[PDB]
Amino acid sequence: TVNGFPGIENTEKRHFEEPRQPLLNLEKKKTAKNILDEQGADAVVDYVKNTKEVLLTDTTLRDAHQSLLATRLRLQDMKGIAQAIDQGLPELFSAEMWGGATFDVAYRFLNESPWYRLRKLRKLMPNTMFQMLFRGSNAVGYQNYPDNVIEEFIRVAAHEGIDVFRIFDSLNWLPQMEKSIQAVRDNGKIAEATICYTGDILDPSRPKYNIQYYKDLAKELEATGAHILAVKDMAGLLKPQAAYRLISELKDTVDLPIHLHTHDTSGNGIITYSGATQAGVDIIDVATASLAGGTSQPSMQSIYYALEHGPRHASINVKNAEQIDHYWEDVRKYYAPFEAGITSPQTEVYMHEMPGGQYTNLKSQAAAVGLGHRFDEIKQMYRKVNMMFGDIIKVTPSSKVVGDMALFMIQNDLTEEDVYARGNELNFPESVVSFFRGDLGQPVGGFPEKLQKIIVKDKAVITDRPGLHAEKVDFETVKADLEQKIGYEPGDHEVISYIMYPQVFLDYQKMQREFGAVTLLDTPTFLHGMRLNEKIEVQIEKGKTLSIRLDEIGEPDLAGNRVLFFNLNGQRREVVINDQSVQAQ
Amino acid sequence: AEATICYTGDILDPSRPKYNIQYYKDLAKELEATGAHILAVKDMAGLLKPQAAYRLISELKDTVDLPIHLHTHDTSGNGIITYSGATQAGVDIIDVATASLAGGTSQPSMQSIYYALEHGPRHASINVKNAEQIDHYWEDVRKYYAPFEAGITSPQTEVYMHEMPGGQYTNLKSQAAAVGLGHRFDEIKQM
Amino acid sequence: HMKKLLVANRGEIAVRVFRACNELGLSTVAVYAREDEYSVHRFKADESYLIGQGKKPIDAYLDIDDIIRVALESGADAIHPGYGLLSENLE
Ligand SMILES: Nc1ncnc2c1ncn2[C@@H]1O[C@@H]2COP(=O)(O)O[C@H]3[C@@H](O)[C@H](n4cnc5c(N)ncnc54)O[C@@H]3COP(=O)(O)O[C@H]2[C@H]1O
Ligand SMILES: [Mg+2]
Ligand SMILES: [Mn+2]
Ligand SMILES: [Mn+2]
């Protein structure tokens, strides 16, 4: 109240209505979660192939607010609609609700444990399969980790309620995914091996990623124990005819079901999904219409109505989908400071091929420095850097390397010839150094040999899997260190979260000891604090509802500490908080 | 002269027989009885599904000899696939807009409909680089009209139940908010 | 066999039975109306639930079905009526 939320600007707390609850016509039916629970993953795969209609994956809970609200969707907003989604939408194959940037961003900003969110969503959604975007050698981070850490993370995630494991690689490398796929197979869950799409397969001018490359990649992914093959289009580059050709050639090649993930950045997502449905795709990733379009996935209602009169239908209940969309439209207005702005179909993404989240992050980073008006030449530098690296796949964390390299190249006024010749003595950001040192992995076709020697001067460059070249982690010693650092016995999930994010978990525990569980507040109260004479009810526990009313805000004293006169549980309590704007003693 | 058939209802739904394909065929014949140069199909609410678009354009192309001018809105979010389906059925001219002012309520993007037909049997007669360069100017000047923008626009599939045009939808919402009935705007839509 | 008690009353007697149950070791469940949201007995129990929504507060405390539903959904075993309200009610 007296200092404002960090990051966003200080504004008055607007009055928000109670969001529109859905009116669902419940139809009880057997879902894929039950088939996984009693029969198994192979029975789930057989059920997917035996379904004529295209299955849908709801990416509302992770990717829709990743690409639009910058992963700022709190668990409190998902808790009011998770039961309604689980009941009124039983035809969904899976719901993507975990992994990706959510794991880091929740700890860093939302001050809530993603394990707590997973536990709550597993409680409120017992009949829906959960999916996390696993990223190969990395899991939620950006640096390499040893194999036992990844296996422990997979074991804990599968124990806590993750059913589908979508594992991709930043450079489409199979050594970085085989261990994760085998661990998911051993844990008894569905392993979704993922092909990261890039370039154009119908353009002869770019022959590095042709149809044959994706065909052999799908072949050698089928050689592993992958349950469902996945095609991830992070930048929305999949043209509809290219989508039809790719899905047809992959169905003629392997026998695994195909899962298509693409974005509506070019505005051609719906027709791409329809063309993949004609070619025989099985599952597609679609979000609700309130959080669809633009940077996010195509709408599930739009893809239902596009295939309503076609030869192949979409397995969804669109009345319940619109009823859920009412609530999502109502709760989108809570995240007004986190909106990117006016959205539009950007066909420029066919040139620079930025992922949408990376596009927004690069735009914010360029606005944070004195280069906010140079975004067009930033895009040109991004395209030229991607070409000069050898046409690598742009997805996290490899897209972050390209973005940081373009930002460094345009910030210090560099040139392709200048970097290629003069920049031997020039410094470089650590992301490009780590990428050329083999931390991310081996790209297809190998590094540019001369430019690598220019970029890294004398540091060690590996050519194998970076997991073998990492220091082993003993869980007992790090468990004891976490226990003495936080003062209580941690679980397996706390240990595996502390291993990947050492400082972030400690900061989260510090804010947990300071402010407590702030995940139980509603979003306007979480962001804008409280108003004068405003009464709120906070349910800290089932049966325990705090009654908080703010009566007065005192003037700041000489020491700078304001006194706030609260009415907690009907009784007056004065809270002393230090104002950060007085700057006086 | 562009004689215009105002599209409404669904032609692939047997539950609504008042606006079947035969009515539109009779209307096209009656409009070709005059000296109309180009036949136009104004889908003012984004009601034209792509299969319905293909069927309508085919059954109008075998009926009359005038060129077909398709106009639809992207309110349902299925404007691009509708335009491509009409392109496969043999439509002649489609109504598009620049990418800065496309999507949502307005017409589908010209760049998006060019890239949707880039590797098809029928291409789109446009220069996409100049279109994107003009789209840059339109994006720059769209920020001048910030008080006149109608908030966050998303693909609304409720336009299949109530069939308001988008401008009439915004005007009705503004009038409902101006008379104190904005909290039951869903009730107003059902009404 | 008895591990949780509900008090279908308000004011002094509710806190008295709460203290008796906490001395005996049982858990406590409270009931309150919207007009009684600031009462002491609401915050003196382990869990508290709102009864008689949209009714007169005296009639809210006399709602037999609402108290029964709260006691069933809260896992309560016993119900102490206190004095007054539904203490002498046979129904
Ligand atoms: N004879 C017909 N009867 C009924 N509807 C017809 C039709 N021709 C087109 N349509 C409808 O119009 C939609 C868009 O047509 P389009 O061929 O341009 O756009 C297609 C096309 O670009 C591509 N595609 C589909 N089958 C293909 C093939 N054998 N080769 C290449 N592309 C194909 O996938 C896109 C979307 O596929 P989708 O069929 O679901 O969506 C089609 C379909 O619903
Ligand atoms: Mg199938
Ligand atoms: Mn995505
Ligand atoms: Mn119009």
Side-chain angles (χ1 to χ4, degrees):
Chain A
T1 307
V2 315
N3 298 329
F5 201 71
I8 78 179
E9 75 173 37
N10 210 311
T11 37
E12 198 73 26
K13 178 189 195 175
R14 308 208 293 109
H15 189 23
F16 284 99
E17 291 93 354
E18 212 311 327
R20 261 167 297 147
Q21 284 298 319
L23 188 129
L24 313 166
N25 295 304
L26 272 91
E27 294 159 353
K28 186 149 285 190
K29 73 185 60 216
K30 167 151 273 203
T31 85
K33 171 63 156 179
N34 310 137
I35 305 159
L36 178 81
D37 261 11
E38 50 252 20
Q39 305 176 47
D42 296 309
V44 155
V45 174
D46 288 1
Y47 159 72
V48 164
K49 285 194 246 200
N50 288 322
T51 307
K52 314 301 288 153
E53 309 164 320
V54 51
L55 289 184
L56 304 188
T57 288
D58 186 32
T59 48
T60 305
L61 293 194
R62 179 202 93 82
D63 215 324
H65 72 97
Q66 175 147 3
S67 307
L68 294 179
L69 308 170
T71 46
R72 295 283 204 279
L73 199 87
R74 307 170 68 254
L75 163 72
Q76 187 65 41
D77 292 83
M78 331 195 188
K79 277 197 293 209
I81 210 66
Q83 169 160 331
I85 286 166
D86 176 88
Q87 287 186 358
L89 289 166
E91 301 108 8
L92 287 165
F93 170 74
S94 92
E96 199 175 57
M97 37 79 51
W98 208 48
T102 63
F103 200 96
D104 167 50
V105 163
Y107 270 146
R108 202 176 302 260
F109 309 102
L110 296 194
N111 289 290
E112 56 185 43
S113 205
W115 301 100
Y116 179 51
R117 162 188 302 175
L118 176 54
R119 287 164 156 162
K120 289 286 118 173
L121 288 193
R122 200 70 262 186
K123 283 168 154 84
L124 282 100
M125 301 215 267
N127 324 295
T128 314
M129 282 198 331
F130 282 174
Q131 170 161 1
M132 141 183 61
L133 185 64
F134 220 73
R135 43 181 90 191
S137 89
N138 326 297
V140 288
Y142 306 97
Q143 55 185 2
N144 67 323
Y145 290 104
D147 274 0
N148 61 322
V149 162
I150 303 307
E151 285 170 38
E152 165 139 282
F153 189 85
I154 286 158
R155 201 203 90 252
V156 175
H159 171 230
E160 291 289 340
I162 295 296
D163 308 343
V164 198
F165 288 74
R166 176 179 257 158
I167 312 110
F168 76 99
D169 180 69
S170 43
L171 297 165
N172 262 329
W173 208 23
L174 303 119
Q176 302 215 141
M177 317 173 32
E178 47 181 40
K179 295 281 115 177
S180 309
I181 284 159
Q182 192 49 54
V184 175
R185 263 210 81 84
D186 292 326
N187 284 278
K189 299 310 188 151
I190 295 142
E192 259 202 69
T194 303
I195 295 176
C196 275
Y197 183 80
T198 175
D200 203 359
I201 67 174
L202 302 190
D203 187 26
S205 163
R206 317 163 46 95
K208 192 181 179 193
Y209 308 102
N210 55 335
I211 313 111
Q212 187 56 44
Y213 161 71
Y214 294 127
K215 279 168 55 66
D216 61 63
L217 192 59
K219 262 295 298 178
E220 59 191 310
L221 278 172
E222 167 77 284
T224 72
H227 298 76
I228 288 167
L229 182 75
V231 184
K232 184 192 189 70
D233 190 18
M234 60 296 300
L237 311 174
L238 202 47
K239 286 179 186 59
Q241 301 96 335
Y244 190 94
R245 274 281 301 276
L246 181 86
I247 297 309
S248 302
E249 288 264 21
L250 287 195
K251 283 294 278 292
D252 291 337
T253 298
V254 306
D255 210 12
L256 302 180
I258 321 288
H259 200 160
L260 187 63
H261 183 97
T262 198
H263 289 230
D264 210 83
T265 318
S266 56
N268 301 311
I270 281 295
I271 178 167
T272 297
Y273 274 163
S274 192
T277 313
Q278 288 336 285
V281 86
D282 283 287
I283 327 168
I284 53 180
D285 295 80
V286 281
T288 191
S290 297
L291 282 159
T295 319
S296 161
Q297 274 77 43
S299 158
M300 84 176 58
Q301 298 92 340
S302 292
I303 204 51
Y304 171 74
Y305 277 104
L307 303 159
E308 198 194 34
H309 297 316
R312 216 175 160 210
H313 285 34
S315 190
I316 210 63
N317 193 5
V318 84
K319 296 317 185 189
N320 302 10
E322 294 161 355
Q323 285 301 285
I324 300 312
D325 203 55
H326 285 27
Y327 180 90
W328 281 117
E329 156 156 28
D330 262 345
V331 305
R332 177 158 193 184
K333 306 176 182 136
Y334 293 169
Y335 306 97
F338 302 111
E339 301 273 357
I342 308 150
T343 190
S344 81
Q346 315 162 2
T347 43
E348 271 224 83
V349 85
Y350 288 124
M351 292 156 33
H352 52 80
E353 313 160 295
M354 290 200 225
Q358 197 266 349
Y359 177 79
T360 60
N361 292 336
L362 189 57
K363 184 169 56 186
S364 50
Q365 282 172 41
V369 294
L371 284 97
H373 65 100
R374 309 205 243 168
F375 209 34
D376 293 310
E377 46 193 316
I378 272 174
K379 252 165 275 186
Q380 287 302 312
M381 201 47 39
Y382 193 94
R383 177 194 222 275
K384 276 204 289 321
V385 155
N386 175 43
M387 217 32 48
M388 97 168 206
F389 277 180
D391 211 316
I392 71 166
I393 307 114
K394 292 140 303 303
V395 80
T396 81
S398 59
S399 82
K400 187 167 287 184
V401 166
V402 186
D404 293 2
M405 172 75 168
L407 193 50
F408 174 78
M409 219 157 161
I410 206 68
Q411 195 153 209
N412 306 8
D413 213 318
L414 261 293
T415 316
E416 213 274 346
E417 309 312 303
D418 228 17
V419 152
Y420 220 92
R422 166 199 166 284
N424 203 12
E425 80 280 336
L426 188 31
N427 217 3
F428 276 125
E430 56 262 7
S431 295
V432 195
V433 174
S434 309
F435 165 66
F436 272 89
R437 272 175 70 189
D439 186 326
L440 291 186
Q442 278 310 298
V444 169
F447 288 102
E449 305 93 354
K450 171 160 308 301
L451 199 45
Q452 173 171 210
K453 282 167 218 153
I454 297 152
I455 280 159
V456 48
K457 277 87 64 174
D458 50 351
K459 282 180 279 301
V461 169
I462 63 171
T463 178
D464 204 6
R465 215 192 74 234
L468 316 158
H469 296 71
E471 194 182 16
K472 204 199 170 69
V473 168
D474 193 14
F475 296 143
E476 320 305 311
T477 73
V478 74
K479 177 142 153 47
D481 189 24
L482 190 58
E483 205 277 327
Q484 63 96 24
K485 268 159 126 64
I486 78 197
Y488 77 96
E489 200 65 77
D492 318 56
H493 59 282
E494 314 205 339
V495 166
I496 202 68
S497 74
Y498 171 62
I499 285 162
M500 310 192 83
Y501 291 111
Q503 197 47 257
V504 188
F505 189 70
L506 292 175
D507 295 339
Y508 161 74
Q509 290 294 327
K510 187 158 62 50
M511 311 305 248
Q512 273 300 114
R513 294 192 308 270
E514 204 175 333
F515 301 133
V518 301
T519 170
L520 311 162
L521 315 153
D522 57 82
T523 312
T525 319
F526 174 80
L527 292 175
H528 313 303
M530 286 261 284
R531 258 176 309 150
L532 255 297
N533 320 98
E534 188 213 343
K535 197 179 314 180
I536 60 161
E537 312 275 337
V538 176
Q539 186 154 15
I540 55 175
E541 189 170 350
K542 175 212 202 272
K544 289 196 175 51
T545 293
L546 292 180
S547 290
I548 306 158
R549 194 187 74 230
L550 183 50
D551 276 346
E552 279 302 318
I553 301 186
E555 39 88 21
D557 60 336
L558 283 194
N561 309 91
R562 287 200 199 239
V563 174
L564 260 67
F565 294 87
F566 278 97
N567 210 34
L568 172 73
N569 294 337
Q571 281 188 5
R572 165 81 61 221
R573 185 166 319 185
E574 306 164 70
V575 183
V576 165
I577 179 71
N578 173 43
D579 207 337
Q580 275 164 11
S581 83
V582 286
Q583 209 189 352
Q585 65 143 335
Chain B
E2 269 210 50
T4 290
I5 293 156
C6 274
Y7 186 84
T8 175
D10 206 359
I11 77 181
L12 296 192
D13 186 32
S15 169
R16 338 195 56 190
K18 197 178 149 149
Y19 292 117
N20 43 8
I21 328 169
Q22 191 55 46
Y23 164 67
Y24 294 127
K25 280 161 103 181
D26 297 334
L27 212 55
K29 282 298 293 183
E30 224 178 336
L31 285 175
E32 207 199 18
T34 56
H37 300 76
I38 306 178
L39 186 66
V41 190
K42 183 196 188 71
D43 180 28
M44 73 297 274
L47 295 171
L48 202 40
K49 286 152 163 126
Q51 297 94 354
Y54 190 92
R55 274 284 284 278
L56 192 83
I57 298 310
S58 280
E59 299 254 10
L60 284 196
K61 275 290 263 217
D62 49 52
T63 295
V64 303
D65 209 26
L66 306 183
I68 315 272
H69 196 168
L70 189 66
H71 175 96
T72 202
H73 287 232
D74 211 5
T75 320
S76 39
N78 301 329
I80 281 297
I81 190 181
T82 296
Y83 271 172
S84 63
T87 315
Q88 295 328 289
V91 84
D92 272 298
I93 310 106
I94 53 180
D95 287 86
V96 283
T98 199
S100 308
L101 286 154
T105 319
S106 156
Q107 275 81 59
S109 171
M110 38 173 35
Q111 301 92 345
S112 300
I113 205 47
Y114 172 76
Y115 277 114
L117 307 161
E118 213 197 31
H119 298 317
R122 258 194 108 171
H123 284 19
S125 195
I126 208 61
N127 202 349
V128 67
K129 317 301 281 180
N130 307 1
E132 291 167 338
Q133 285 297 292
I134 293 158
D135 159 53
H136 290 9
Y137 179 93
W138 282 117
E139 163 150 347
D140 280 304
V141 304
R142 206 197 154 150
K143 277 163 304 172
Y144 290 176
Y145 305 94
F148 303 109
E149 298 211 46
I152 291 185
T153 323
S154 76
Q156 192 197 191
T157 46
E158 278 214 85
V159 84
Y160 288 126
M161 324 173 29
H162 67 87
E163 301 146 353
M164 322 188 204
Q168 198 268 348
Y169 176 80
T170 60
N171 296 325
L172 193 67
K173 166 157 45 58
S174 93
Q175 286 171 36
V179 304
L181 317 175
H183 66 89
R184 42 182 161 159
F185 188 52
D186 41 350
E187 222 175 322
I188 278 185
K189 291 155 60 140
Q190 211 88 39
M191 171 66 19
Chain C
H1 55 267
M2 201 205 277
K3 300 150 307 291
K4 188 167 279 188
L5 196 135
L6 178 130
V7 183
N9 222 306
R10 50 157 317 269
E12 165 257 335
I13 187 61
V15 199
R16 170 81 202 84
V17 183
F18 289 159
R19 287 151 179 175
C21 288
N22 271 109
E23 284 154 24
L24 287 184
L26 322 172
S27 182
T28 52
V29 184
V31 291
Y32 72 106
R34 177 55 55 197
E35 286 83 4
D36 219 7
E37 63 188 328
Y38 288 134
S39 168
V40 166
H41 84 282
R42 173 189 157 182
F43 319 105
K44 288 274 180 173
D46 285 30
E47 41 182 353
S48 172
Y49 300 93
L50 159 76
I51 66 171
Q53 207 266 354
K55 301 172 61 158
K56 212 258 182 206
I58 286 300
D59 308 354
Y61 277 109
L62 294 194
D63 205 317
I64 307 154
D65 214 322
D66 226 348
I67 293 175
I68 273 287
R69 177 199 58 81
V70 156
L72 286 169
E73 88 163 8
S74 53
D77 315 337
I79 289 188
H80 202 310
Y83 55 80
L85 297 181
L86 302 166
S87 187
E88 311 204 23
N89 193 202
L90 177 68
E91 220 280 334

